[PDB]
Design a protein around this nucleic acid. Sequence first.
RNA 1: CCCGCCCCUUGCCUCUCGGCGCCGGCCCGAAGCGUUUACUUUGAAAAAAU
RNA 2: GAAACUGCGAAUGGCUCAUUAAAUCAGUUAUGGUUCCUUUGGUCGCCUACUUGGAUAACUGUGGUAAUUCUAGAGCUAAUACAUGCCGACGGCGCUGACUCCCUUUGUGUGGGAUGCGUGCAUUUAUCAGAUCAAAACCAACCCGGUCGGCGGCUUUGGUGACUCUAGAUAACCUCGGGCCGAUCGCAGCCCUCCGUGGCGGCGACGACCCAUUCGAACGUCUGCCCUAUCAACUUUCGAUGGUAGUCGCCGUGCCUACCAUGGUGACCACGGGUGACGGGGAAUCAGGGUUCGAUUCCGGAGAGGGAGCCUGAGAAACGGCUACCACAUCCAAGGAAGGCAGCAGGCGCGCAAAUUACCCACUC
Lengths: 59, 61, 206, 263
Amino acid sequence: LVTPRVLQHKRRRIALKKQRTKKNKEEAAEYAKLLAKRMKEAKEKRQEQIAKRRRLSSL
Amino acid sequence: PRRLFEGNALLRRLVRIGVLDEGKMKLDYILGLKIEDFLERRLQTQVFKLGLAKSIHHARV
Amino acid sequence: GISRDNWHKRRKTGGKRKPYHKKRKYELGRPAANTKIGPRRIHTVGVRGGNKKYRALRLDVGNFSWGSECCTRKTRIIDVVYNASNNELVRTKTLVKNCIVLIDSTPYRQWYESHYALPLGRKKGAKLTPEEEEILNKKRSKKIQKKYDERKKNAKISSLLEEQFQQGKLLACIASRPGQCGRADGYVLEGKELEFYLRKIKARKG
Amino acid sequence: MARGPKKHLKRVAAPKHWMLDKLTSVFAPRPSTGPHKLRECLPLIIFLRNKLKYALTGDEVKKICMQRFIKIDGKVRADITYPAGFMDVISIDKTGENFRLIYDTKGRFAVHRITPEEAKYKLCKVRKIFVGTKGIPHLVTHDARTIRYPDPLIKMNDTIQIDLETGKITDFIKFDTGNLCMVTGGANLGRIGVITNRERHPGSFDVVHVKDANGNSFATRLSNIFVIGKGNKPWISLPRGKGIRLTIAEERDKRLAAKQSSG
RNA sequence: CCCGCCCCUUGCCUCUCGGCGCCGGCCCGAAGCGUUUACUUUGAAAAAAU
RNA sequence: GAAACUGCGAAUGGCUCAUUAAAUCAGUUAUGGUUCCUUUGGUCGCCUACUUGGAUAACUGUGGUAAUUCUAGAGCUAAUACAUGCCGACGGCGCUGACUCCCUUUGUGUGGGAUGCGUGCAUUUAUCAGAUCAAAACCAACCCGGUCGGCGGCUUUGGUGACUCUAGAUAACCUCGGGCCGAUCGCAGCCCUCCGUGGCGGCGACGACCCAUUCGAACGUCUGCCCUAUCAACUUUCGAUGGUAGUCGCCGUGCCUACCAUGGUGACCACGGGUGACGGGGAAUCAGGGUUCGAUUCCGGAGAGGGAGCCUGAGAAACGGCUACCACAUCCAAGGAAGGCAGCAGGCGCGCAAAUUACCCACUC
């Protein structure tokens, strides 16, 4: 038999499920920002190789 | 390190009971120790020597 | 009951060793599945650490594949023909890993016809006329040429397959242990493998 | 007896650095299963009645834990044989005190009280990097926490500062020569010194030299090294003696020099 | 009885990638090892009680 | 709040030293060849849902046997026992292409497109990728800087000494009747185009899937052992050694089977026999070198009268679990029933030879 106490637990059951999905969103968002920032460094390595060839030649 | 640390603390203990002088205090003087010096430090001997008794036989009692 | 001990049997010098302990329960042995062809009968056996091992008796279907052109369809498993492990199993129609079996060969034709828009070898030209020519030519026209042209200058299909295809038989190789998995699965033969097992078959029997 | 796992632990095979006696009975506490290795643990009850002497019997410690004044890493634990180990913070909030578990120079877990400010984080070694499903990376630490989405430039034998409440590391060190290290395993224990050199072999272990600022060189296996902060710059408050480690001759000399054994 | 010198001196190079230099150019640490063992010397590594 | 269902444990401890000579065991190494209750940390949205289905115990009442912690028949009623199964959020992704639209007849350059099918993880199979070394010259089709003959500039998950690793892509498979994705419970609050509903929030408790971790477990490497030659050759289809494929098992492996090869070990002591031999940490004596002992408090192993088989469980070939034989021995209304002190005491017997049928969970766990 359903009482008010029962119904709260069923609302809280789904609130947590939704919250869990919301957290996996924000974490991956921030990680993508951070990941894409470094991959500066990737660019830098490529740049460095090109630069090295030119520099070596420079006489 | 074994010879230093051991010898120092050995000789310290021989000096602490006073069967050995600190005018000696070398490991060679350990071997100059003998039976009678121990027996002198016994309580019954020191009762007799520095307190009231009439014989050594009194002092033990 | 039946053991799997390593502490029975000799050592290198021909010496013997003797027990010191009774059989432990991490040494185990439960007799072979001996699965055949027939309707699915499965028994579930609980094993060590928990876990379930399905043992299948009387399989009839396996998911074979033709990975050259990457189609894999569910097909019936007709009979065993060659088993390199033992000869006796072939006579008694018993199925184990690395048998050579026969299949229906049906969905592969349907797949070919629909994708390359060209028929297979046929008995006669009146075979396809009532049905199987009304899906082999279609109202699309609208990729009569645009699609079909690259299917008209690729694909040969190998000879040794095609002569069998007409009979409705193809030679495939069981890959999976049925007694542990609970499933039969495999791949269909091609190339030099298919030449090899043909010769073994032809040597031994007709 | 070997039809399953054992549950008793004796006193006379107990890990020796908990400083137990032997005229109390046969058993000793036994660490229960948890994040730290059994040998490397200090069970809870040994900190609370065989060190600081709040309690006097084991039943008394159970009566403390039940009222939940104890925390470990900001969460509440309530066992009497919780297996806390190196780099955790205990927090009694009914005294306003915070402890840290760190190695003495004689290789045993000391009492190292600390500011509440320091007690909001701990130093965690990286041990494994593991790509899970759907291209997500992971860390794994010696306190066995799985922190998802680490930035990629952190490698193993590095160390990371973890915020007890939220995970999500604040800083990290990248393992190299000229970084300040503590020893955590091996026959050397609690010694502090800069890395100085490393050595690599193909399989079958490898070793890592260490040198301190008092001019002593010693070495230890790779997997007993732990980083504590940048070269000559600890990011933790260290217990007295500073990991230098004296010999016994010099240590004797100090006590008879101040002529002090009470105060 | 730690650097070097007569010919040798921790035998060589080759170099190339990531630091140190000095004024593009040049120099020297780390990388393969000295035919193999034993032997000897140092480290690492080891349950407690006794 | 007795009882009873349900959950968890009884696989720890305790005791003995019979078997056991490369076995056990000790030091050292390996799982990239594997399993793991539990803890800790992550993982937890492709005519019923205001909550689905029907029985069992205690209980009530009636009984049977010489006799048991036996059990029958009848009448009730539960669930985190037992058995079912929807909601929510799929605004996505891929492949067919009814077709349709624009410009160069076409081709091609183009843009859209209904109708369908597929579309989380776990499972099994197949296939693909898992890329970065050292530079240019012209001809054919071509982007951009830029032109009405071509010049300069691009394409790449993570990790180990090493993995057929990890993750990714594609095509399917599905354990059904035997993978997952909550019909569970206790503390304490709110807000309502508003009158107890519709909305939503805290603090817990419980359960479950996978990965990691902890506690281990199991196999494997190298080296180490008491006496005997009045024990010198032994081992093989009743597998001995190896090869190829399979079966079985948690996995590796002649562990097992088929087919095939003809090896393996030894005077550096094999093989066989003996042991008042459990192994080691140790103990007694001793100048140096040794000799003898180790049943017995720690660690490892083996076993519960002798043998064999097996249920339950994450874990047992369990014996204060079960089933049978053999050896013992008890009760009985003679029809049947029941048993295993090398657990603590205690008794008999054996002997040269060994304690109280005591008190108590306060300490230690």
